[PDB]
Amino acid sequence: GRKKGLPEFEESAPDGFDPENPYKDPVAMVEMREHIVREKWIQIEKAKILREKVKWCYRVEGVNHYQKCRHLVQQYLDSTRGVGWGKDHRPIS
Amino acid sequence: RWATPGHEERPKGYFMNRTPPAPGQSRKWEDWELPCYITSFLTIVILGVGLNAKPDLSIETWAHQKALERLEMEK
């Protein structure tokens, strides 16, 4: 019986997972995998908000989008370098 | 040509290639139609009233409220 609202996942690296020997405590391994997936999805939905900002900067500005959206474009392309499970550019998370 | 009434009284050929029933009668249903129609009704009811009423639990909704919160706090 879930309670009405958004899911609640605690935001903290599970203690016990030491990257020297990942296959030492199995319980922390799955928790760490889920956590890493969660921050990767956070960094994806953070890069999509910047895409929305760029999209509505290209439309509101118009012809002057080359100077009024320069800050947004470089921010978006900087947050798109390490999106996630994509091109060979894989972040060291 | 756009005034004359048509010649075809009823559409050519019977629907689903079935002889229409006896006068003052009805198309007697087969042994599968009712158990299949109640199932094709409950399916639509469950999907429409169930998928549109289940909570919006997801990883694209939880993260769109966790990135929208930290993208603000950086300022």
Binding site: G1, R2, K4 | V49, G50, A53, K54, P55
Partner: peptide, 15 residues
């Protein structure tokens, strides 16, 4: 009163 409320409070109970 309206079906959506009961459906929501039933799906939440099932989950």
């Amino acid at each position: 009163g309206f079906i959506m409320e009961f459906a929501e409070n039933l799906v939440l109970r099932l989950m």
